[PDB]
């Protein structure tokens, strides 16, 4: 019905407009910080150096993002038969971190090719991983159930300490352990892991955080495809908690 | 079935394992060659410039990246998280594109977009699915006036509705980005499909360049663009999917 559709929207611009005033107020301030300190770090290398120009100044930074763009660090391989495989996999996953992306014309025209076909092929594979938990966590759940039916429990607060057991229990397996390694071995704050978890298992993947993506970290070849590993099977937990967090939206609209 | 898991999962790594060939097979030789590139712009500069030392040209370089990281261009008055431009940036992260050309850098900002995306991702799931219907009604009732003259047939229909949503939700809004934020042909298209798959890179981003003084109307025009869009692409992988089913 385009009356509820309507309503919907309404709620949708007005959780825009709030989302984006709360993010200024706590953005808006370090911006403007930053834009202060490269003004004054570009204005004290012209000071300090006479011999360069404005112009030939604005041309270095300019190569040096070219160069950073492209993924090569203008300090001091991202393509190589693992770092593709990872980056072919986070256009499948529709994660799309973008820490690296396609510069060629042709791997432009690939990356859409490959994406239009592909990410339909991981659906099958993730709603497969989906039905395989499903099942798992299922039949664990189903032993407390019967346990809570004996005590004489309602209906209802038995369905709301099910929801509460699965979330818990998949929050500890997917989020909570899988941080404490991000933690370690990428060497993030408590926060920056979880936040990455959460910002790669959503599917959003802003690329600001990207596991094995220091240089100077120098980790073994089995943890990138362990990390995509991780992403298969949480990918199905946070789409099953996305899930509910939507079906407890719809108690709310009734 | 397991039985069934495990093959969609052989097939997907073989998928991946030759998707990694191609795109090293078009990427590596130009990466090497931006390696080259910028070894030797530094080199030139060094030269040119003998009262810089490579340690302060490493200092500079660095503090210019700092200032990229955080969503400050380290090249030349203009914001990022403006009423306008905030509001987008929480569209990006509700439809999960999540281009990451700006992303939150305080802790408080990073706690903010996990509780954010927790439970605004369901919220756009009914406004999508919403969307998704009528399109389904409008398209619908479109395709049977067609479908009538032809009675008097399915394949024709996907065919009809791909080709018709291809032009007002790809190629139209592709070539308003050509002229508007001033990219390629190519560059545009990809820019569509990146955005409306929720892949979003960031590599193009609308509304996003500091040269570009576009109006207010631009920028929230973008996501009822991508508010619609992400609706008929959802539809086009699903009729993907589909036919894959068919293939299975
Ligand atoms: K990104
Ligand atoms: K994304
Ligand atoms: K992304
Ligand atoms: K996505």
Redo the contacts between chains.
Sequence with gaps: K?K??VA??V??VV???T??????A???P??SS??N??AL??AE?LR?????SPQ?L?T?????????????S????????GS??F???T??T?????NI????????????L????????????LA??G??LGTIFGKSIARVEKVFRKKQVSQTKIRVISTILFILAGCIVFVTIPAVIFKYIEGWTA??S??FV??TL???????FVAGGNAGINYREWYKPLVWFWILVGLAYFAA???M??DW??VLSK
Aim: proline share 3%; glycine share 12%.
């Design positions: 385009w509820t559709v919907i929207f709620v949708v959780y825009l407009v989302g984006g005033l709360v993010f200024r706590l953005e808006q370090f911006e930053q834009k300190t490269i770090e570009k290398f300090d150096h006479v011999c360069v030939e604005e270095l930074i300019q190569h040096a993002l070219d160069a950073d763009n492209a993924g090569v203008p300090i001091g391989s991202h393509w190589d038969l593709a495989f980056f072919a996999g256009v499948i529709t994660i799309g971190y973008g992306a396609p510069s060629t014309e042709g791997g432009k025209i690939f990356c859409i490959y994406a239009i076909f592909g990410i339909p092929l991981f659906g099958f594979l497969g991983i039905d395989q926060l920056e979880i936040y959460v910002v959503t599917t959003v993947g802003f690329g600001d908690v996305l899930s967090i939507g939206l719809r």
